[PDB]
């Protein structure tokens, strides 16, 4: 008794909640590169979709815990938007 899609697995699916981020300058999708600092000690990249307006959206899904650190260069040059960090909190965390 609920629109039940088939999407989610048992393996896994859907963990954390998603980090969309838009980049305020204009940029070419080209020389430019994305990269995730995991508070494991691992790395990871992040997703660059280019918009149907024209701009980039950068999202990466968080799948552990703890604080993580993205690293956005564009034609090789840092952008004033990066380095940043983002808490990765519990799910469903909040009464």
């Known amino acids: 008794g ?11 699916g859907l963990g954390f909640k998603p980090f969309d981020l838009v ?3 204009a940029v070419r999708k080209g020389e430019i590169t994305g990269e995730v600092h995991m508070p ?8 660059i979709v280019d918009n149907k307006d024209g701009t980039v959206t950068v ?13 956005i260069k564009y034609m ?3 952008i004033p938007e990066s380095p940043l960090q983002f808490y990765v ?6 009464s």
């Open 76 to 78: 090789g040059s840092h």
């Open 40 to 47: 494991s000690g691992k790395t990871a990249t992040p997703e």
């Open 59 to 71: 999202r990466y899904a968080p799948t552990e815990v703890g604080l993580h650190e993205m690293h």
């Open 23 to 25: 980049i305020p300058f």
């Open 89 to 94: 909190n519990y799910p469903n965390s909040g």
């Open 2 to 12: 609920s629109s039940g899609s088939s999407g989610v697995s048992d393996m896994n």
